[PDB]
Design a protein around this nucleic acid. Sequence first.
DNA 1: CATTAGA
DNA 2: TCTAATG
Length: 327
Amino acid sequence: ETLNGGITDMLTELANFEKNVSQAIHKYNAYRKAASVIAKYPHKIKSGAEAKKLPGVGTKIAEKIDEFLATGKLRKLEKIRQDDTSSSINFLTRVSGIGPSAARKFVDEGIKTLEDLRKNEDKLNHHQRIGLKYFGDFEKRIPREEMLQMQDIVLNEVKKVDSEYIATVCGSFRRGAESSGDMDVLLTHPSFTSESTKQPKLLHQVVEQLQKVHFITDTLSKGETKFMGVCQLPSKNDEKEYPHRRIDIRLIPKDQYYCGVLYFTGSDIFNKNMRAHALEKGFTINEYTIRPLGVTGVAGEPLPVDSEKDIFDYIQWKYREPKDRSE
DNA sequence: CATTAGA
DNA sequence: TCTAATG
Ligand code: NA
Ligand code: NA
Protein backbone atom coordinates (compact mmCIF):
# COMPACT_ATOMS: atom_id res chain seq x y z
CA GLU A 1 0.00 0.00 0.00
CA THR A 2 3.00 2.27 0.56
CA LEU A 3 6.12 0.16 1.12
CA ASN A 4 5.81 -1.09 -2.43
CA GLY A 5 4.31 2.07 -3.96
CA GLY A 6 7.14 3.10 -6.29
CA ILE A 7 6.98 -0.34 -7.52
CA THR A 8 3.46 -0.92 -8.26
CA ASP A 9 3.17 2.55 -9.77
CA MET A 10 6.27 2.22 -12.06
CA LEU A 11 5.08 -1.20 -13.16
CA THR A 12 1.47 -0.28 -13.97
CA GLU A 13 2.86 2.69 -15.95
CA LEU A 14 4.92 0.07 -17.69
CA ALA A 15 1.95 -2.21 -18.39
CA ASN A 16 -0.41 0.54 -19.33
CA PHE A 17 2.00 1.29 -22.07
CA GLU A 18 2.42 -2.03 -23.89
CA LYS A 19 -1.27 -2.41 -23.92
CA ASN A 20 -1.84 1.01 -25.55
CA VAL A 21 0.90 2.53 -27.55
CA SER A 22 2.14 -0.98 -28.30
CA GLN A 23 -0.15 -3.98 -28.81
CA ALA A 24 1.89 -6.31 -26.49
CA ILE A 25 -0.95 -7.96 -24.60
CA HIS A 26 1.25 -10.47 -22.90
CA LYS A 27 4.06 -8.22 -21.58
CA TYR A 28 1.28 -6.01 -20.56
CA ASN A 29 -0.55 -8.67 -18.72
CA ALA A 30 2.79 -9.73 -17.18
CA TYR A 31 3.65 -6.35 -15.49
CA ARG A 32 0.27 -6.30 -14.09
CA LYS A 33 0.49 -9.58 -12.29
CA ALA A 34 3.98 -8.59 -11.22
CA ALA A 35 2.80 -5.23 -10.04
CA SER A 36 0.21 -7.33 -8.31
CA VAL A 37 2.39 -9.70 -6.32
CA ILE A 38 5.10 -7.16 -5.55
CA ALA A 39 2.37 -5.09 -3.88
CA LYS A 40 1.08 -7.93 -1.79
CA TYR A 41 4.38 -8.71 -0.07
CA PRO A 42 4.84 -7.46 3.41
CA HIS A 43 8.33 -6.19 3.28
CA LYS A 44 10.55 -3.54 1.71
CA ILE A 45 11.86 -4.87 -1.53
CA LYS A 46 15.48 -3.98 -1.09
CA SER A 47 16.59 -5.29 -4.36
CA GLY A 48 15.27 -6.80 -7.47
CA ALA A 49 16.87 -10.14 -6.47
CA GLU A 50 14.83 -10.30 -3.29
CA ALA A 51 11.82 -9.44 -5.52
CA LYS A 52 12.73 -12.00 -8.09
CA LYS A 53 11.83 -14.53 -5.51
CA LEU A 54 8.23 -13.82 -6.25
CA PRO A 55 6.21 -15.41 -8.84
CA GLY A 56 6.00 -13.48 -12.13
CA VAL A 57 9.01 -11.90 -11.05
CA GLY A 58 11.33 -12.74 -13.77
CA THR A 59 14.60 -11.39 -14.79
CA LYS A 60 12.96 -8.72 -16.88
CA ILE A 61 10.92 -6.92 -14.23
CA ALA A 62 13.49 -7.41 -11.56
CA GLU A 63 16.08 -5.54 -13.56
CA LYS A 64 13.58 -2.80 -13.71
CA ILE A 65 13.05 -2.67 -10.01
CA ASP A 66 16.95 -2.53 -9.52
CA GLU A 67 17.40 0.66 -11.65
CA PHE A 68 14.29 2.26 -10.09
CA LEU A 69 15.75 1.26 -6.76
CA ALA A 70 19.20 2.58 -7.46
CA THR A 71 18.26 5.89 -9.11
CA GLY A 72 15.06 7.89 -8.63
CA LYS A 73 14.26 6.88 -12.17
CA LEU A 74 14.01 4.53 -15.01
CA ARG A 75 14.87 5.49 -18.63
CA LYS A 76 12.17 3.49 -20.42
CA LEU A 77 9.73 5.39 -18.32
CA GLU A 78 11.57 8.61 -18.91
CA LYS A 79 11.72 7.88 -22.59
CA ILE A 80 7.94 6.94 -22.96
CA ARG A 81 6.86 9.88 -20.84
CA GLN A 82 8.62 11.89 -23.48
CA ASP A 83 7.34 10.08 -26.65
CA ASP A 84 5.11 12.28 -28.74
CA THR A 85 3.62 9.48 -30.67
CA SER A 86 2.88 7.55 -27.52
CA SER A 87 1.92 10.69 -25.67
CA SER A 88 -0.70 11.29 -28.29
CA ILE A 89 -2.29 7.92 -28.07
CA ASN A 90 -2.72 8.54 -24.47
CA PHE A 91 -4.72 11.65 -25.05
CA LEU A 92 -6.96 11.06 -28.21
CA THR A 93 -8.00 8.12 -26.19
CA ARG A 94 -9.93 10.60 -23.96
CA VAL A 95 -12.40 11.13 -26.69
CA SER A 96 -15.36 9.01 -25.77
CA GLY A 97 -15.48 6.68 -28.79
CA ILE A 98 -11.78 6.61 -29.35
CA GLY A 99 -10.11 3.53 -27.85
CA PRO A 100 -6.55 2.26 -28.37
CA SER A 101 -7.22 0.80 -31.72
CA ALA A 102 -8.69 3.90 -33.17
CA ALA A 103 -5.98 5.87 -31.42
CA ARG A 104 -3.15 4.29 -33.36
CA LYS A 105 -5.08 4.49 -36.56
CA PHE A 106 -5.71 8.28 -36.23
CA VAL A 107 -2.18 8.93 -35.20
CA ASP A 108 -0.88 6.97 -38.08
CA GLU A 109 -2.91 9.13 -40.40
CA GLY A 110 -1.62 12.18 -38.62
CA ILE A 111 -4.55 13.37 -36.44
CA LYS A 112 -3.03 13.83 -33.04
CA THR A 113 -5.00 16.52 -31.54
CA LEU A 114 -8.24 18.09 -30.84
CA GLU A 115 -8.20 20.26 -33.85
CA ASP A 116 -6.79 17.47 -35.95
CA LEU A 117 -9.81 15.57 -35.18
CA ARG A 118 -12.11 18.57 -35.94
CA LYS A 119 -10.92 18.86 -39.49
CA ASN A 120 -11.64 15.31 -39.79
CA GLU A 121 -15.08 15.05 -38.45
CA ASP A 122 -15.83 12.77 -41.39
CA LYS A 123 -13.25 10.42 -40.09
CA LEU A 124 -15.26 9.96 -36.93
CA ASN A 125 -18.44 8.10 -36.32
CA HIS A 126 -21.51 9.34 -34.58
CA HIS A 127 -20.30 8.14 -31.20
CA GLN A 128 -16.80 9.64 -31.54
CA ARG A 129 -18.45 12.76 -32.95
CA ILE A 130 -20.64 13.45 -30.00
CA GLY A 131 -17.52 12.50 -28.04
CA LEU A 132 -15.71 15.33 -29.93
CA LYS A 133 -18.32 17.79 -29.78
CA TYR A 134 -18.55 17.16 -26.06
CA PHE A 135 -14.94 16.69 -25.19
CA GLY A 136 -15.02 19.13 -22.15
CA ASP A 137 -18.23 18.35 -20.29
CA PHE A 138 -17.35 14.61 -20.63
CA GLU A 139 -14.39 15.31 -18.54
CA LYS A 140 -16.31 17.51 -16.13
CA ARG A 141 -17.51 16.05 -12.89
CA ILE A 142 -21.11 16.08 -11.73
CA PRO A 143 -22.13 17.70 -8.54
CA ARG A 144 -24.45 15.80 -6.35
CA GLU A 145 -26.59 18.91 -6.30
CA GLU A 146 -26.87 18.29 -10.03
CA MET A 147 -27.32 14.53 -9.65
CA LEU A 148 -30.23 15.16 -7.38
CA GLN A 149 -31.45 17.52 -10.17
CA MET A 150 -31.68 15.16 -12.98
CA GLN A 151 -32.77 12.40 -10.64
CA ASP A 152 -35.90 14.31 -10.05
CA ILE A 153 -36.83 14.80 -13.64
CA VAL A 154 -36.07 11.22 -14.55
CA LEU A 155 -38.29 9.64 -12.08
CA ASN A 156 -40.95 12.09 -13.27
CA GLU A 157 -41.36 11.04 -16.73
CA VAL A 158 -40.72 7.46 -15.66
CA LYS A 159 -43.78 7.63 -13.56
CA LYS A 160 -45.67 9.79 -16.15
CA VAL A 161 -45.31 7.12 -18.87
CA ASP A 162 -46.33 4.13 -16.81
CA SER A 163 -46.92 4.19 -13.12
CA GLU A 164 -45.65 0.60 -12.97
CA TYR A 165 -42.00 1.43 -13.63
CA ILE A 166 -39.08 1.18 -11.22
CA ALA A 167 -35.92 3.19 -11.59
CA THR A 168 -33.00 3.83 -9.40
CA VAL A 169 -30.02 5.86 -9.99
CA CYS A 170 -27.21 3.63 -8.89
CA GLY A 171 -23.45 4.30 -8.50
CA SER A 172 -21.53 6.40 -5.96
CA PHE A 173 -24.37 8.93 -6.00
CA ARG A 174 -26.32 6.07 -4.82
CA ARG A 175 -23.69 5.87 -2.00
CA GLY A 176 -23.86 9.63 -1.00
CA ALA A 177 -20.82 10.78 -3.04
CA GLU A 178 -20.24 14.61 -3.09
CA SER A 179 -20.06 14.39 -6.94
CA SER A 180 -20.22 11.94 -9.78
CA GLY A 181 -19.15 11.20 -13.38
CA ASP A 182 -22.46 10.04 -15.02
CA MET A 183 -25.93 8.88 -14.25
CA ASP A 184 -26.71 5.25 -13.84
CA VAL A 185 -30.26 4.51 -13.93
CA LEU A 186 -31.25 0.80 -13.44
CA LEU A 187 -34.79 0.28 -14.64
CA THR A 188 -37.30 -2.48 -14.46
CA HIS A 189 -40.87 -3.31 -14.97
CA PRO A 190 -43.03 -6.10 -13.53
CA SER A 191 -44.18 -6.88 -17.00
CA PHE A 192 -40.65 -8.16 -17.77
CA THR A 193 -38.83 -10.98 -16.17
CA SER A 194 -36.47 -13.86 -16.66
CA GLU A 195 -38.82 -15.60 -19.18
CA SER A 196 -41.58 -13.08 -20.28
CA THR A 197 -39.83 -12.68 -23.51
CA LYS A 198 -39.00 -8.97 -23.53
CA GLN A 199 -40.89 -5.81 -24.27
CA PRO A 200 -38.17 -3.62 -25.87
CA LYS A 201 -40.86 -1.06 -25.90
CA LEU A 202 -40.52 -0.75 -22.08
CA LEU A 203 -37.05 0.78 -22.53
CA HIS A 204 -37.90 2.48 -25.89
CA GLN A 205 -40.92 4.14 -24.16
CA VAL A 206 -38.98 6.12 -21.66
CA VAL A 207 -36.12 7.19 -23.82
CA GLU A 208 -38.75 8.77 -25.94
CA GLN A 209 -40.28 10.55 -23.02
CA LEU A 210 -37.12 12.07 -21.51
CA GLN A 211 -36.15 13.03 -25.06
CA LYS A 212 -39.48 14.57 -25.74
CA VAL A 213 -39.33 17.02 -22.93
CA HIS A 214 -35.62 17.76 -23.27
CA PHE A 215 -33.52 15.67 -21.18
CA ILE A 216 -32.02 13.28 -23.57
CA THR A 217 -30.30 15.21 -26.39
CA ASP A 218 -28.23 12.66 -27.99
CA THR A 219 -27.98 9.21 -29.10
CA LEU A 220 -24.76 7.40 -28.40
CA SER A 221 -26.31 4.06 -28.63
CA LYS A 222 -29.57 2.41 -28.28
CA GLY A 223 -30.57 -1.15 -28.00
CA GLU A 224 -33.60 -2.91 -26.82
CA THR A 225 -32.17 -3.24 -23.30
CA LYS A 226 -29.47 -0.67 -22.68
CA PHE A 227 -29.64 2.92 -24.07
CA MET A 228 -26.43 4.97 -24.04
CA GLY A 229 -26.59 8.75 -24.08
CA VAL A 230 -26.42 12.45 -23.21
CA CYS A 231 -28.39 14.89 -21.23
CA GLN A 232 -28.69 18.32 -20.04
CA LEU A 233 -30.34 20.09 -17.38
CA PRO A 234 -32.55 22.83 -18.71
CA SER A 235 -30.79 26.05 -18.71
CA LYS A 236 -32.68 28.26 -16.37
CA ASN A 237 -33.59 31.89 -16.78
CA ASP A 238 -30.32 32.45 -18.55
CA GLU A 239 -26.77 33.45 -17.94
CA LYS A 240 -26.13 29.85 -17.09
CA GLU A 241 -26.63 26.88 -19.33
CA TYR A 242 -25.84 23.44 -17.92
CA PRO A 243 -23.15 21.35 -19.66
CA HIS A 244 -23.57 17.95 -21.50
CA ARG A 245 -23.62 14.70 -19.31
CA ARG A 246 -23.25 11.01 -20.01
CA ILE A 247 -26.28 8.79 -19.12
CA ASP A 248 -27.08 5.11 -19.07
CA ILE A 249 -30.57 3.70 -18.96
CA ARG A 250 -30.83 -0.13 -18.71
CA LEU A 251 -33.85 -2.56 -18.62
CA ILE A 252 -34.14 -5.34 -16.12
CA PRO A 253 -36.32 -8.40 -15.53
CA LYS A 254 -38.06 -7.37 -12.29
CA ASP A 255 -37.07 -10.79 -10.91
CA GLN A 256 -33.40 -9.64 -10.65
CA TYR A 257 -33.46 -5.95 -9.71
CA TYR A 258 -32.32 -6.02 -6.11
CA CYS A 259 -29.07 -7.89 -6.74
CA GLY A 260 -28.60 -5.63 -9.79
CA VAL A 261 -29.28 -2.77 -7.59
CA LEU A 262 -27.05 -4.03 -4.76
CA TYR A 263 -24.22 -4.58 -7.13
CA PHE A 264 -23.88 -1.43 -9.36
CA THR A 265 -24.11 0.66 -6.16
CA GLY A 266 -21.01 -1.14 -4.90
CA SER A 267 -18.49 0.02 -3.57
CA ASP A 268 -16.25 -2.30 -5.51
CA ILE A 269 -15.01 -3.48 -2.09
CA PHE A 270 -18.36 -3.53 -0.30
CA ASN A 271 -19.64 -6.03 -2.72
CA LYS A 272 -16.46 -8.04 -2.74
CA ASN A 273 -16.66 -8.27 1.04
CA MET A 274 -20.37 -9.06 1.39
CA ARG A 275 -19.83 -11.36 -1.54
CA ALA A 276 -17.04 -13.22 0.23
CA HIS A 277 -19.28 -13.54 3.25
CA ALA A 278 -22.20 -15.31 1.47
CA LEU A 279 -19.67 -18.02 0.63
CA GLU A 280 -19.39 -18.82 4.25
CA LYS A 281 -23.02 -18.21 4.86
CA GLY A 282 -23.53 -20.92 2.20
CA PHE A 283 -24.20 -18.71 -0.79
CA THR A 284 -23.26 -17.14 -4.06
CA ILE A 285 -24.07 -13.58 -4.96
CA ASN A 286 -23.49 -12.27 -8.49
CA GLU A 287 -24.89 -9.46 -10.61
CA TYR A 288 -28.49 -10.88 -10.96
CA THR A 289 -29.02 -13.46 -8.31
CA ILE A 290 -28.16 -15.31 -5.10
CA ARG A 291 -28.00 -19.07 -5.12
CA PRO A 292 -27.74 -21.74 -2.29
CA LEU A 293 -24.43 -23.57 -2.14
CA GLY A 294 -24.48 -27.33 -2.40
CA VAL A 295 -21.59 -29.10 -0.74
CA THR A 296 -20.68 -31.27 -3.87
CA GLY A 297 -18.56 -28.22 -4.64
CA VAL A 298 -21.30 -26.04 -6.09
CA ALA A 299 -25.03 -25.68 -6.37
CA GLY A 300 -27.73 -23.51 -7.88
CA GLU A 301 -31.29 -22.37 -7.36
CA PRO A 302 -32.07 -18.69 -7.33
CA LEU A 303 -33.61 -17.59 -4.08
CA PRO A 304 -36.44 -15.06 -4.34
CA VAL A 305 -35.59 -11.36 -3.87
CA ASP A 306 -38.15 -8.59 -3.18
CA SER A 307 -35.62 -6.08 -1.81
CA GLU A 308 -32.02 -5.30 -0.97
CA LYS A 309 -33.16 -6.70 2.39
CA ASP A 310 -33.81 -10.32 1.38
CA ILE A 311 -30.28 -10.44 0.17
CA PHE A 312 -29.09 -9.30 3.65
CA ASP A 313 -31.43 -11.64 5.67
CA TYR A 314 -30.24 -14.52 3.50
CA ILE A 315 -26.57 -14.01 4.34
CA GLN A 316 -27.69 -13.04 7.85
CA TRP A 317 -26.10 -9.66 7.80
CA LYS A 318 -26.78 -6.19 8.95
CA TYR A 319 -28.78 -4.08 6.51
CA ARG A 320 -26.24 -1.59 5.42
CA GLU A 321 -27.55 1.75 4.30
CA PRO A 322 -26.13 2.43 0.97
CA LYS A 323 -24.58 5.48 2.65
CA ASP A 324 -22.11 3.25 4.47
CA ARG A 325 -21.82 0.56 1.85
CA SER A 326 -18.45 2.14 1.50
CA GLU A 327 -16.52 -1.05 2.24
C1' DC B 1 -18.51 -9.81 -19.07
C1' DA B 2 -22.36 -8.18 -21.86
C1' DT B 3 -24.65 -5.34 -25.11
C1' DT B 4 -24.22 -2.28 -29.45
C1' DA B 5 -22.01 -0.16 -33.87
C1' DG B 6 -20.34 -0.91 -37.78
C1' DA B 7 -18.14 -2.38 -41.47
C1' DT C 1 -19.43 -12.34 -38.64
C1' DC C 2 -15.85 -10.06 -36.04
C1' DT C 3 -13.82 -6.40 -33.45
C1' DA C 4 -14.06 -2.08 -30.72
C1' DA C 5 -15.75 0.65 -27.34
C1' DT C 6 -18.37 1.24 -23.15
C1' DG C 7 -19.31 0.13 -18.76
NA1 NA D 1 9.92 -16.45 -9.03
NA1 NA E 1 -12.18 7.22 -24.35
